[PDB]
């Protein structure tokens, strides 16, 4: 009942930039914080930021202050990414993930992902 | 004195206060309140033993009760709490205690616990009673012809 | 102006608080009947 | 930052028994008296499902078979008995300071 | 109120409902008392620190 | 005056299998739960389970499946330990333990010990 | 399971002065805010006394010069003055979850 629509895959060239989307639905979405986690096969699933759509502020994980951007459409209920030189290793899953059913707020609401490629 | 009480165990000064047993919890500055279901005296079981096997040292620190909505109902877990309302998780645990001697109130008298075990059940006049009541023998003037 | 001194307390000695007490309602008020009357000596 | 380990990179495991691993927070994570420690599971292709938050509070939609552990640096998970559904990769992550992080995983598979 | 309290310092509770200074603590939902022996005022001395 | 009888040595066949026991006096014997310990001198003090009398449960030491199996007889306030296979390794003192003083659940009643010897 | 360590295997201590040993739990043993830990001396052919229980607790009938401190995984067993009633077998060991087990042991004896 709550759920994450997300994009689908990108192919991309790599340095390029792009905007990925998180649909919310099932509740209010200006009432719970947007993360964004970052999944590479090789590397361990890494957290990126994360936005708070009431007010728009957000917090970003330090190594992505201009590679990834986020930004809130309460109107359409859906939070963005803006990734900006995209890397061969960017490449990789990103999943947006929510509150809302554990007691404290932790990342129980996922997203199916997006899938984002750069090559040639 | 009746903030702070309400503070402290809001479900008993909620369910003075509103006229009914009611679960309460404090919001802030108000009280939420939520009306408790009734449940027959005989539909209620006490487990003899309230230790925990799976693990030592800790003990059920309020009798374990299984009971029945409906006379028929299936049987429910539950643990035992103050002014006889049975709470639906049994999560109240504490060290285990030596000479640990109890009366929790259960129906209309006490159910006597000794190293966390049962011993007995006790009339509720089998305790001697002192009296937080101050009494104020008003008697009224009679009638004069 | 006298001290105290308390040693642990044991279940030899329980005391419980007396329950509330159901004391009276009020009385139902005498009924009256209203009406005209006209005393005589 | 905070640095998770988790002593089974892989833990290949028999059905029916104890399944056990460990999570190293390398300091303190508790908070208000509450260790900010919580465990994901994910089955590969598709995201990451809650498993116990608070180190100790099992999450909602799981089986008590999954139980938690630890305070401190120190956080263990327990499963018992262990079922072809836990055959997945596990991640202990805190959720402490703001650049809250993850555990390097654990494997569980059959012997 | 009074349950409250006698959650609270059982000590000053069961000393005022009984009617003279008693230890006392509960045993779940029972009072367990203990009566105090008084001690004579000029018979206490207190540490300066 | 809470005092734990136990018997005395056992010579025995190895692979054989023995009964070692412990008179619990002093206390009301199905109030507290009674643990039992393996001494050898070689290696440390081992716990090997306990049982509860009141209910006849009890919990083992996860080594001491069929090696080892408590009964209690609250009639005779004697706990029982039934010992199969044992090993030459098994040649060791056990003891029988309680609660009561210590204001936890902790093990500060023992008995004389039993020192259980297998040979030929 | 809970491993219990002491750092002191045998520790020969003179009449009088301090005596330490250490206890390691490996991880949390503390529930409650009570910490499960048990000190146990065991003069050699007679069996084990309790010292101190809850690890901050002294035993009952057991003279003060015993002291007990620790906390999360680190015990640790103070005596002072140490005399010859101490030259003993000493056993820390936890009683948070069901298989409690036993520290290594420390030895105690004159320089």
New interface residues.
């Given amino acids: 009942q709550v759920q994450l629509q997300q994009s689908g895959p990108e192919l991309v060239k790599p340095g390029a930039s792009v905007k990925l989307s998180c649909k919310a639905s099932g509740y209010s979405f200006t009432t719970y914080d947007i993360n964004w986690v970052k999944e590479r096969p090789g590397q361990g699933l890494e957290w990126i930021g994360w936005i708070y759509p009431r007010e728009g502020s957000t917090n970003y994980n330090e190594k992505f202050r201009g590679k990834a951007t986020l930004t809130a459409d309460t109107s359409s209920s859906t939070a963005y990414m803006e990734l900006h030189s995209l890397t061969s290793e960017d490449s990789a899953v990103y999943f947006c993930a929510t509150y809302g059913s554990s007691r404290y707020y932790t990342m129980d609401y996922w997203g199916q992902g997006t899938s984002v490629t750069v090559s040639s | 004195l009746w903030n702070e009480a309400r503070k402290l165990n809001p479900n008993a000064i909620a369910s003075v206060t509103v006229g009914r047993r009611v679960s309460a919890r404090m919001l802030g500055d108000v009280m939420a309140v939520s009306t408790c279901v009734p449940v027959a005296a005989d539909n209620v079981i006490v487990q003899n033993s309230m230790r925990i096997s799976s693990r030592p040292g800790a003990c059920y620190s309020r009798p374990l009760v299984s009971f029945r909505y409906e006379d028929q109902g299936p049987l429910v877990e539950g643990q035992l709490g103050e002014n006889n309302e049975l709470r639906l998780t049994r999560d109240a645990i504490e060290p285990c205690t030596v000479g640990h001697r109890r009366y929790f109130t259960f129906g209309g008298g006490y159910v006597y616990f000794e190293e966390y075990a049962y011993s007995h059940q006790l009339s509720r006049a089998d305790i001697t009673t002192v009296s937080t009541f101050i009494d104020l023998n008003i008697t009224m003037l009679e009638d004069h012809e | 102006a006298n001290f105290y001194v308390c040693p642990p307390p044991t279940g030899a000695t329980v005391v419980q608080f007396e329950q509330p007490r159901r004391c009276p309602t009020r009385p139902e008020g005498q009924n009256y009947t209203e009406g005209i009357a006209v005393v005589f000596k | 930052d905070i640095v998770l380990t988790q002593s089974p990179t892989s833990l290949a495991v028999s059905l029916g028994q104890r399944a056990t691993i460990s999570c190293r927070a390398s300091e303190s994570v508790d908070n208000f008296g509450?260790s900010?420690m919580?465990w994901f599971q994910?089955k590969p292709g598709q995201?990451?499902?809650?498993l116990i938050?608070?180190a100790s509070?099992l999450?909602?939609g799981v089986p008590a078979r999954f139980s938690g552990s630890?305070?401190?640096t120190?956080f263990?998970l327990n499963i018992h008995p262990m079922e072809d559904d836990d055959t997945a990769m596990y991640?202990c992550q805190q959720?402490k300071e703001?650049?809250?992080?993850?555990?390097?995983?654990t494997k569980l598979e059959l012997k």
């Fill in positions: 509450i900010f919580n994910q995201p990451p499902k809650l938050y608070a509070n999450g909602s630890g305070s401190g120190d263990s991640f959720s703001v650049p809250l992080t993850f555990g390097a995983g």
